[PDB]
Amino acid sequence: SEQLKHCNGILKELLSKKHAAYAWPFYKPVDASALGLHDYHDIIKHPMDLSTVKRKMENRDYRDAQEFAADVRLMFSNCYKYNPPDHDVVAMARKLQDVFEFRYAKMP
Amino acid sequence: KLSEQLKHCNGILKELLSKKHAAYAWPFYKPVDASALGLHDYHDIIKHPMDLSTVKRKMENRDYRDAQEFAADVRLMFSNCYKYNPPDHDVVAMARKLQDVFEFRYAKMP
Ligand SMILES: Cc1cc(-c2cc3c(=O)n(C)cc(-c4cc(C(C)(C)O)ccc4Oc4ccc(F)cc4F)c3o2)cc(C)c1OCCO
Numbered sequence: 312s313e314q315l316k317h318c319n320g321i322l323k324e325l326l327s328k329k330h331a332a333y334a335w336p337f338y339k340p341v342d343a344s345a346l347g348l349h350d351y352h353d354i355i356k357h358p359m360d361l362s363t364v365k366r367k368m369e370n371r372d373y374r375d376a377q378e379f380a381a382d383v384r385l386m387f388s389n390c391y392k393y394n395p396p397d398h399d400v401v402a403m404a405r406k407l408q409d410v411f412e413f414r415y416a417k418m419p
Numbered sequence: 420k421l422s423e424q425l426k427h428c429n430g431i432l433k434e435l436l437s438k439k440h441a442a443y444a445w446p447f448y449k450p451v452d453a454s455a456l457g458l459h460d461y462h463d464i465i466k467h468p469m470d471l472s473t474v475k476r477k478m479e480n481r482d483y484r485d486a487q488e489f490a491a492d493v494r495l496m497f498s499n500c501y502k503y504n505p506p507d508h509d510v511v512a513m514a515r516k517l518q519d520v521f522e523f524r525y526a527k528m529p
């Protein structure tokens with residue numbers, strides 16, 4: 312509950328403008344419809360992005376910091392699972408995760 | 420089943436401690452010898468240490484009910500690295516590079 316106020320702090324930093332170069336594809340859920348990804352939801356069974364995570368933080372859905380991470384990592388995993396590992400979205404994901412895991416480990 | 424999950428978690432561990440990734444995998448092969456490295460506070464800051472040999476033993480001993488628990492320890496390993504070290508330092512770059520092989524390999528796992 313005091314540690315969730317930090318998890319919020321992380322989400323805030325994840326969405327700040329510094330990282331926006333590589334963070335943006337995770338602000339909004341994947342638009343599989345528009346991108347023509349007919350198979351996206353057959354493979355990604357539990358979509359997740361940072362907006363969906365924010366709603367949940369607002370709605371007090373995350374009990375501990377562990378549940379918060381679960382979803383944030385799930386975002387990145389969905390990216391690695393669906394996408395060939397060369398593609399740039401993967402290399403951005405990696406970039407953003409690297410910041411995440413930074414702040415999460417630092418968290419008191 | 421659930422032991423089909425773990426079969427693949429074995430395949431991931433194998434990859435992680437293999438030939439190719441050795442450049443950046445080696446500081447996680449065995450525990451952090453704080454004593455030797457002159458780290459008078461490592462075990463103060465890191466309450467639950469973790470490394471790949473430890474993971475490997477647990478995988479043999481069958482302490483992991485599922486991949487979800489396996490991942491847990493691997494993530495914990497990388498976490499501790501990131502927790503203890505400032506972000507510039509080289510270990511971290513390697514930690515990061517190995518985590519990227521894992522999440523790749525883990526996320527592919529049918
Ligand atoms: C065009 C295309 C896109 C994607 C794909 C995967 C994937 C993904 O995992 N995430 C998290 C985000 C995107 C993505 C999302 C969006 C919107 C604004 C619609 O939400 C826009 C572009 C996206 O993908 C990118 C493609 C190339 C990039 F350099 C960067 C991207 F973010 C996204 O796109 C995957 C494939 C295979 C693809 O190519 C279609 C086959 O040629």
Ligand SMILES: Cc1cc(-c2cc3c(=O)n(C)cc(-c4cc(C(C)(C)O)ccc4Oc4ccc(F)cc4F)c3o2)cc(C)c1OCCO
Pocket residue numbers: 446447449450451452453455456457458499500503504509510
């Ligand atoms: C000497 C020293 C070492 C560490 C440190 C942190 C850290 C770590 O998080 N992991 C996972 C692994 C090592 C590490 C461990 C080992 C052994 C074989 C003893 O287990 C050997 C080297 C290690 O780290 C490196 C030190 C210097 C390098 F140029 C590269 C390293 F991988 C490791 O070393 C951190 C600091 C700040 C440090 O400087 C202490 C005062 O000089």
